[PDB]
Design a protein around this ligand. Sequence first.
Ligand SMILES: OC[C@H]1O[C@H](O[C@H]2[C@H](O)[C@@H](O)[C@@H](O[C@H]3[C@H](O)[C@@H](O)[C@@H](O)O[C@@H]3CO)O[C@@H]2CO[C@H]2O[C@H](CO)[C@@H](O[C@H]3O[C@H](CO)[C@@H](O[C@H]4O[C@H](CO)[C@@H](O)[C@H](O)[C@H]4O)[C@H](O)[C@H]3O)[C@H](O)[C@H]2O)[C@H](O)[C@@H](O)[C@@H]1O
Ligand SMILES: [Ca+2]
Length: 862
Amino acid sequence: MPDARAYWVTSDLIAWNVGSVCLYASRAAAMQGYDSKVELQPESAGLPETVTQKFPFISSYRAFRVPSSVDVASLVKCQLVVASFVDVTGLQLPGVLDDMFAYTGPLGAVFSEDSVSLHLWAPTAQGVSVCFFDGPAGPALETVQLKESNGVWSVTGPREWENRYYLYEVDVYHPTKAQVLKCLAGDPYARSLSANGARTWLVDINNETLKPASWDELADEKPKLDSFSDITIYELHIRDFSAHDGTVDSDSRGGFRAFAYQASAGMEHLRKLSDAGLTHVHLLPSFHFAGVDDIKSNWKFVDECELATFPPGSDMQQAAVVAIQEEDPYNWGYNPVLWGVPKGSYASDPDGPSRIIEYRQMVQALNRIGLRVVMDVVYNHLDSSGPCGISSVLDKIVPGYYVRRDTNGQIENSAAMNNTASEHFMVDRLIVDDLLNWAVNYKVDGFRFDLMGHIMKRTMMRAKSALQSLTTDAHGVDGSKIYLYGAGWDFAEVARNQRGINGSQLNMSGTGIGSFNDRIRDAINGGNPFGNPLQQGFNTGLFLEPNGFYQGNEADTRRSLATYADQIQIGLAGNLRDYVLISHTGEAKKGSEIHTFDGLPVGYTASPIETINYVSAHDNETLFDVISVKTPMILSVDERCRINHLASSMMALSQGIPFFHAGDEILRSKSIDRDSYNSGDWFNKLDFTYETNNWGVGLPPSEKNEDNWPLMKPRLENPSFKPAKGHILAALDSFVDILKIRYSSPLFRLSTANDIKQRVRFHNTGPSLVPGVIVMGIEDARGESPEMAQLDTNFSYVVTVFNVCPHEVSMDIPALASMGFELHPVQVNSSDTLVRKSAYEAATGRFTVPGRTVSVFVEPRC
Ligand SMILES: OC[C@H]1O[C@H](O[C@H]2[C@H](O)[C@@H](O)[C@@H](O[C@H]3[C@H](O)[C@@H](O)[C@@H](O)O[C@@H]3CO)O[C@@H]2CO[C@H]2O[C@H](CO)[C@@H](O[C@H]3O[C@H](CO)[C@@H](O[C@H]4O[C@H](CO)[C@@H](O)[C@H](O)[C@H]4O)[C@H](O)[C@H]3O)[C@H](O)[C@H]2O)[C@H](O)[C@@H](O)[C@@H]1O
Ligand SMILES: [Ca+2]
């Protein structure tokens, strides 16, 4: 977009950072060449507080008054410049468009008894018509003019318009082309589409033929959720789930329908996890995104049997995958086009109703096996901008409004590309309207907000209120149980609240909305995903087992290990700002007083429900891969498997909300791909036969990985690094056991900061702490005249020992001596021979824990 350094902030005020200012307008975009010239006098009252609160980054700008004689509604449809006498620049219009034309009425389609209405917000447009098609691929049948009122274009037609397909013909000034262009655009409020969103389907989302059997009774069948503190999350990509599952019919692999195959290997796997206690599945982007063709017959994919013949450390597999990666069935989907419609490529038929019905059937099916469904929502950026292409919708209709721009008028791209501006009224409105669409129309149980730091906190909080007030009687869903969390990363143009108070980790403290705890992730794994890949952490051999490629000294690494242990313990106690820990110096510190290496407070939340504890996710290296990179090369795969289990167990037995990447439980590899978003089914394989974990399938794609190929190649080629079926199955068995343990006692899932401060203590702390061991005790009411509520009818105390040392340790804890501790019944019965050797001795309060083991001890009541 061109140079635009001035802002039209309200109907009567323009803001521009100058030290004789005039406004020029041309309806034909001919600019000399203007239709209208207007002198702007300096406004001695300056910018109102409402303006500076909305746009903090321009609070220093001088104010200029637009005379009340000006027809603002007409001028915003023109090419506009302001001039200072000579400096000429364009005008950024969102302020005035909101001030004059903010609209809360119906958008998209409204169905009444005898009519269908369409409304489009397009306040800068010179004309809007609707072009109707009979059929998803047929020719235009008729064009109907819409009428404008206050920036909204509308038309009401007969009920027979239902199930037509349509597009809007929008005549609008596009700054990138310096022309008024006739753009063919989909409906921002679309609820279904033809293939690839080429046209919008004029569907009544409430139509009974779009509901699976018993859909209206789904609320009655949903899994009970007593508390947000009972949540565990499993993060899964829809295509990954079934792309390689031979127990699913070829036709139904990779999409929504595979979730309706009860006895498939995949659904049996999810059943196993759900029955162990898993509560929520977080599905990667499942709305209309670009980068995958909805027409399956257009897909190109490599012969996997061919690629299997190539050497494990070769660059040939990735070259083959990359050659057709833009035309294959595969993308994570963080490329938003239209938020309110299910992705067509995941439907059996991308035209008509199947994408709606099959999405609903997926939610129903997951609910019926005991899993609530979370959507990964991506409101922070758009795939495309500008007037051209099927994949640009929002910016095609109202250019320069839905996207955030810098102070020169250029689109901000920190999110990926085409950052949105949730600070603008109709963007905020669309986001919340979309969330309510998914909650009511699809009965979705929660939302993970991609780049939540790019979203205004006021949008997050309004979304929370709107969702959690939905009721079964009025909306068919219990909104009180809908859970929100997100990745509250604070960077680029939204950092330091520059565009308003944003959804950063620190800003979302005390909101009851969760955020990913990167502190526990980095302390466990070591380093960070964008630092040195060989930097070790608490669970990857720092100090105890140096890898010999990296390091510092060993008083360095001993203290570095202890520093990481402190960070982990704060996270294990819900990552609270006010939780007090005896730190490794011996000084007692609040969680917020302990800092990361970038000076960030480690603990920042006001509640465990605000913490999403993780070591792995779709981004960056899988758990198995990060362990395989960072640990000494000489470790056996058997040892690394125990290390995998330790990491996932630290999550599963933490206070807060545990988050697992799909495949944590089965040693999933991507052959060390750090960003597999476009790396195809080959690198992203999820193998529910358990025969392979996808280690050693070639060097991963060069685009994101080539700099690290030298460390990857020898490991990928080393047969000693590759697990067998037995290892994979053992990992799954111990994973399920640890989930069962979490759900065996309410003590692991405390619901408030007060409860955690009262009940949770760590017993291996201070300057003489034993390296590589964390001991965590959780107390319940005991004796007559109890001190606290009794939460657990079975156990009066639980102790977890995490031992990352390669050798057995004995921890003597006097505070826990002379008690009735025994190994947890689940671990007494474990298929793992080692954990069964764990023991407690009352005389000394001694907990004996084998090397590379997590041992859970319980004090039974009576
Ligand atoms: O945003 C681009 C960036 O995305 C990924 O980066 C992740 C990162 O891996 C993850 O760890 C975290 O980073 C934070 C870190 O964890 C914190 O400790 C702290 O240090 O702050 C960090 C953030 O500053 O989050 C990052 C963002 O991830 C999330 O957002 C992404 C955008 O929605 C999404 O990225 C995926 O999708 C995009 C779009 O398809 C894709 O981008 C490709 O295409 C773009 C053209 O549109 C082009 O500009 C990019 O250059 C190209 O890569 C990403 O590759 C793909 O991962 C995340 O999935 C979502 O969770 C990623 O790892 C980086 O490689 C990438 O540069
Ligand atoms: Ca692809």
